[PDB]
Amino acid sequence: VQLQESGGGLVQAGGSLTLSCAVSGLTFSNYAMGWFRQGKEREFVAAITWDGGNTYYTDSVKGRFTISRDNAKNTVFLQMNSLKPEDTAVYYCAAKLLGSSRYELALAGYDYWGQGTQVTVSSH
Amino acid sequence: QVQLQESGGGLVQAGGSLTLSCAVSGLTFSNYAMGWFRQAPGKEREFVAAITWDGGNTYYTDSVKGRFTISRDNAKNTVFLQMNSLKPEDTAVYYCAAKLLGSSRYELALAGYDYWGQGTQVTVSSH
Amino acid sequence: AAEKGFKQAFWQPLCQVSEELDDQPKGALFTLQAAASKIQKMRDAALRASIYAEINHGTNRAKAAVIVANHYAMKADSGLEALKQTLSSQEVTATATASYLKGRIDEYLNLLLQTKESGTSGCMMDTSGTNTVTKAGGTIGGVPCKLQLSPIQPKRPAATYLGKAGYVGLTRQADAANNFHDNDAECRLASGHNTNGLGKSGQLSAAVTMAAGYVTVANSQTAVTVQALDALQEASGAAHQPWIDAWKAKKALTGAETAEFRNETAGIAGKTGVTKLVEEALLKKKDSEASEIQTELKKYFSGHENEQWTAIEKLISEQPVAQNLVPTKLGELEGNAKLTTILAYYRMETAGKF
Amino acid sequence: AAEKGFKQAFWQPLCQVSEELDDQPKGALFTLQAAASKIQKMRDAALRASIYAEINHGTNRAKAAVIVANHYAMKADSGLEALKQTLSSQEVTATATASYLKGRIDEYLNLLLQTKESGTSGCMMDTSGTNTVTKAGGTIGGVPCKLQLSPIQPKRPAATYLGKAGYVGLTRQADAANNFHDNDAECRLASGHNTNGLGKSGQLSAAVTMAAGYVTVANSQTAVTVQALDALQEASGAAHQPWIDAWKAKKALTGAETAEFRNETAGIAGKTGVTKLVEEALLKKKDSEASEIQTELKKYFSGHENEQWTAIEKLISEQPVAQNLVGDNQPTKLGELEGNAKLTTILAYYRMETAG
Ligand SMILES: *[C@@H]1O[C@H](CO)[C@@H](O[C@@H]2O[C@H](CO)[C@@H](O[C@@H]3O[C@H](CO)[C@@H](O)[C@H](O)[C@@H]3O)[C@H](O)[C@H]2NC(C)=O)[C@H](O)[C@H]1NC(C)=O
Ligand SMILES: *[C@@H]1O[C@H](CO)[C@@H](O[C@@H]2O[C@H](CO)[C@@H](O[C@@H]3O[C@H](CO)[C@@H](O)[C@H](O)[C@@H]3O)[C@H](O)[C@H]2NC(C)=O)[C@H](O)[C@H]1NC(C)=O
Residues near ligand 2 (Cβ within 6 A): D 38, 41-42, 45, 48-49, 263, 313, 316-317, 335-336
C332 ligand 1 Cβ < 6 A? yes
Estimate the crossing angle of helix C24-55 against helix C336-353, to 10 degrees.
Answer: 20
Q: Ligand 1 pocket test: pick from C317, C330, C342 the residue with the most ligand atoms within 8 Å of its Cβ.
A: C317
d(CA C308, CA C296): 14
d(CA D103, CA D124): 18
Q: How far is the CA of A69 from the centre of ligand 1 (A)?
A: 29
Return the residue of A nearest to D261 by Cα: A97
User: Chain D closest CA to B81's CA: distance in Å?
Assistant: 22
In sign, the C-alpha dihedral spanning B62, B65, B67, B71 is: positive
SS3 assignment, position D161: coil
Enumerate residues 6+ apart whose C-beta is below 8 A from B72.
B29, B34, B51, B55, B78, B79, B80
d(CA C195, CA C187): 11
d(CA D259, CA C171): 52
Enumerate neighbours of D (3 or more CB pairs within 8 A).
Answer: A, B, C
Biggest CA-to-CA distance, chain D: 94
Q: How far is the CA of C88 from the centre of ligand 1 (A)?
A: 26
d(CA C209, CA B83): 52
| Cβ proximity of C113 and D210 under 8 Å | no
- Left if phi > 0, otherwise alpha if psi is -120 to 50, otherwise beta: which for D141? left
Enumerate residues 6+ apart whose C-beta is below 8 A from A37.
A43, A45, A87, A89, A90, A91, A92, A119
| Cβ proximity of D130 and D120 under 8 Å | yes
Return the residue of B nearest to D339 by Cα: B54
Is D75 at the interface with chain C, CB within 8 A? no
Q: Residue D331 burial (CB < 10 Å; 0-12/13-18/19+)? A: middle
Q: In what order do the strands lie in the sheet with A2-6?
A: A2-6, A17-24, A75-80, A65-70
What angle (nearest 5°) sits at the alpha carbon of residue D347, between those of residues D345 and D351?
A: 120
Q: How far is the CA of C17 from the centre of ligand 1 (A)?
A: 40
Of A99, A107, A112, A88, which is closest to residue A4 (Cα–Cα)? A112
Substitution target in B58, B100, B108, B110 with the highest count of C β-carbons within 10 Å is B100
Judging contacts by C-beta atoms under 8 Å, the chain B residues touching residue D327 are 56
How many beta carbons lie within 10 A of that of residue D106, not counting itself?
28
Final residue belonging to a domain, choices D255, D271, D296? D255
What residues does A91 pair with on adjacent strands?
A37, A117
Are D117 and C241 inside 8 Å of each other by CB? no
| Cβ proximity of D261 and D32 under 8 Å | no
For residue C262, the ligand 1 atom closest to its alpha carbon is 38
Of A43, A45, A40, which is closest to residue A21 (Cα–Cα)? A45
Same domain flag for C191 and C230: yes
For residue C314, the ligand 1 atom closest to its alpha carbon is 31
d(CA D145, CA D14): 9
Cβ-Cβ pairs closer than 8 A, B with D, add up to: 7
d(CA C275, CA C67): 9
SS3 assignment, position D192: coil
Final residue belonging to a domain, choices D212, D233, D255? D255
User: Chain B closest CA to C229's CA: distance in Å?
Assistant: 21
DSSP assignment of D287-336 equals S--HHHHHHHHHHHHSSSSHHHHHHHHHHHHHPBPPGGGS-SSS--BGGG
d(CA A42, CA A48): 18
Enumerate neighbours of B (3 or more CB pairs within 8 A).
Answer: C, D
SS3 assignment, position D182: strand
Same domain flag for D67 and D185: no
How many beta carbons lie within 10 A of that of residue D41, not counting itself?
18
SS3 assignment, position D102: helix
Same domain flag for C348 and C211: no
SS3 assignment, position D141: coil
Resolution, angstroms, 1 dp: 1.9
Are C347 and D29 inside 8 Å of each other by CB? no
> Smallest Cβ distance to C290: which of B1, B99, B106?
B106
Domains defined along chain B, listed by start: 3-125 (2.60.40.10)
Q: How far is the CA of D280 from the centre of ligand 1 (A)?
A: 28
d(CA D240, CA D136): 30
Counting CB pairs under 8 A, whether chains B and A reach 3 or more, is no
SS3 assignment, position D181: strand
| Cβ proximity of D315 and D52 under 8 Å | yes
| Cβ proximity of D224 and D180 under 8 Å | yes
Tally of CA atoms within 13 A in the half-sphere of D139 that contains its CB? 5
> Smallest Cβ distance to B107: which of C78, C275, C289?
C275
DSSP assigned state of B53: T
What residues does A19 pair with on adjacent strands?
A78
Task: Please state the separation of Cα D27 from the chain's center in Å.
Answer: 4
Same domain flag for D103 and D236: yes
Is D348 at the interface with chain B, CB within 8 A? no
Residue count of chain C? 354
Q: How far is the CA of B30 from the centre of ligand 2 (A)?
A: 22
Judging contacts by C-beta atoms under 8 Å, the chain D residues touching residue A103 are 269-270, 275, 290, 293
What angle (nearest 5°) sits at the alpha carbon of residue D46, between those of residues D42 and D50?
A: 170
Enumerate residues 6+ apart whose C-beta is below 8 A from A108.
A96, D266, D267, D269, D270
User: Chain C closest CA to B28's CA: distance in Å?
Assistant: 6
Tally of CA atoms within 13 A in the half-sphere of C316 that contains its CB? 29
What residues does D125 pair with on adjacent strands?
D132
H-helix or E-strand spanning residue B42: none
Same domain flag for D223 and D233: yes
Same domain flag for D164 and D51: no
C317 ligand 1 Cβ < 6 A? yes
| Cβ proximity of B102 and B32 under 8 Å | yes
| Cβ proximity of C350 and D351 under 8 Å | no
| Cβ proximity of B117 and B97 under 8 Å | yes
Final residue belonging to a domain, choices C255, C288, C322? C255
d(CA A10, CA A29): 32
d(CA C310, CA C200): 78
d(CA B81, CA C228): 42
Which ligand is in closest contact with the Cα of C68?
A: 1
In sign, the C-alpha dihedral spanning D46, D48, D54, D59 is: negative
Please report, for residues D72, D306, D345, the alpha-carbon distance to residue D262 in angstroms, rounded to integers and kept in the order given.
Answer: 11, 15, 26
Same domain flag for C243 and C334: no
| Cβ proximity of B32 and B24 under 8 Å | yes
Q: How far is the CA of C45 from the centre of ligand 1 (A)?
A: 7
User: Chain D closest CA to A114's CA: distance in Å?
Assistant: 15
Same domain flag for C153 and C243: yes
What pairing do the DSSP bridges indicate for beta strands B78-83 and B68-73? antiparallel
Judging contacts by C-beta atoms under 8 Å, the chain B residues touching residue D342 are 54
What pairing do the DSSP bridges indicate for beta strands B10-13 and B120-125? parallel
Amino acid at A63: G
Judging contacts by C-beta atoms under 8 Å, the chain B residues touching residue D339 are 54
In sign, the C-alpha dihedral spanning A78, A81, A86, A90 is: positive
Residue count of chain D? 356
Of C54, A27, A99, which is closest to residue D273 (Cα–Cα)? A99
Estimate the crossing angle of helix C24-55 against helix C306-318, to 10 degrees.
Answer: 80
| Cβ proximity of C13 and C161 under 8 Å | yes
What residues does C170 pair with on adjacent strands?
none
Enumerate residues 6+ apart whose C-beta is below 8 A from D273.
A98, A100, C340, C341, C344, D67, D70, D71, D74
How many beta carbons lie within 10 A of that of residue C238, not counting itself?
13
Are D259 and A111 inside 8 Å of each other by CB? yes
| Cβ proximity of C113 and C140 under 8 Å | yes
Enumerate residues 6+ apart whose C-beta is below 8 A from A27.
D78, D81, D82, D85, D86, D258, D260
DSSP assigned state of D116: B
Is D266 at the interface with chain A, CB within 8 A? yes
Same domain flag for C146 and C225: yes
Nearest CA to ligand 1 atom 30: C45
D 291-320 residues with CB below 8 A of C? none
Are B53 and D342 inside 8 Å of each other by CB? no
Total domain count, chain C: 2
Judging contacts by C-beta atoms under 8 Å, the chain D residues touching residue A102 are 275, 287
Enumerate neighbours of A (3 or more CB pairs within 8 A).
Answer: C, D
| Cβ proximity of B92 and B63 under 8 Å | no
Judging contacts by C-beta atoms under 8 Å, the chain D residues touching residue C85 are 33
Q: Ligand 2 pocket test: pick from D37, D41, D316 the residue with the most ligand atoms within 8 Å of its Cβ.
A: D41
Q: Spell out a b/e string for C119-129, using b for 16 or more CB atoms within 10 Å of the CB, else e.
A: ebbbbbbbeeb
Q: Where are the beta strands (DSSP E) in chain B?
A: 3-7, 10-13, 18-25, 32-39, 46-51, 58-60, 68-73, 78-83, 92-100, 115-116, 120-125
Q: Residue A39 burial (CB < 10 Å; 0-12/13-18/19+)? A: exposed
Same domain flag for C141 and C66: no
| Cβ proximity of D78 and A32 under 8 Å | no
Are D95 and C92 inside 8 Å of each other by CB? yes
DSSP assigned state of D191: -
Please report, for residues A36, A41, D10, the alpha-carbon distance to residue A67 in angstroms, rounded to integers and kept in the order given.
Answer: 12, 22, 55
Residue count of chain A? 124
Same domain flag for D266 and D278: yes
Q: Residue B127 burial (CB < 10 Å; 0-12/13-18/19+)? A: exposed
Judging contacts by C-beta atoms under 8 Å, the chain D residues touching residue A32 are none
**In the 3-class helix/strand/coil scheme, how is chain A assigned residue by residue?**
CEEEEECCEEECCCCCEEEEEEEECCCHHHEEEEEEECCCCCEEEEEECCCCCCEEECHHHCCCEEEEEEHHHCEEEEEECCCCHHHCEEEEEEEEECCCCHHHHHHCCCCEECCCEEEEECCC
Q: How far is the CA of C92 from the centre of ligand 2 (A)?
A: 30
Nearest CA to ligand 1 atom 19: C332
Is C290 at the interface with chain B, CB within 8 A? yes
Return the residue of A nearest to D256 by Cα: A26
Residue D290 phi, psi (nearest 5): -60, -35
Q: How far is the CA of D83 from the centre of ligand 2 (A)?
A: 22
Of B30, B61, B62, B108, which is closest to residue C269 (Cα–Cα)? B108
**In the 3-class helix/strand/coil scheme, how is chain C assigned residue by residue?**
CCCEEECHHHHHHHHHHHHHHCCHHHHHHHHHHHHHHHHHHHHHHHHHHHHHHHHCCCCHHHHHHHHHHHHHHHHHHHHHHHHHHHHHHHHHHHHHHHHHHHHHHHHHHHHHHHCECCCCCECEECCCCCCECCEECCEECCEECCCCCCCCCCCCCCCCCCCCCCCCCCCCCCCHHHHCEEEEEECHHHCCCCCCCCCCCCCCCCCEEECCCCEEECCCCCCCEECCCCCCCCCCCCCCHHHHHHHHHHHCCCCCCCHHHCCCCCCCCCCCCHHHHHHHHHHCCCCCCHHHHHHHHHHHHCCCCHHHHHHHHHHHHHCECCHHHCCCEHHHCCCHHHHHHHHHHHHHHHHHHC
d(CA C106, CA C82): 34
Q: How far is the CA of D84 from the centre of ligand 1 (A)?
A: 20
Please report, for residues B18, B60, B97, D80, the alpha-carbon distance to residue B22 in angstroms, rounded to integers and kept in the order given.
Answer: 13, 17, 9, 33
For residue D48, the ligand 2 atom closest to its alpha carbon is 32
Domain membership of residue D101 as a residue range: 1-33+86-255
Same domain flag for C124 and C78: no
Judging contacts by C-beta atoms under 8 Å, the chain C residues touching residue B110 are 270, 290
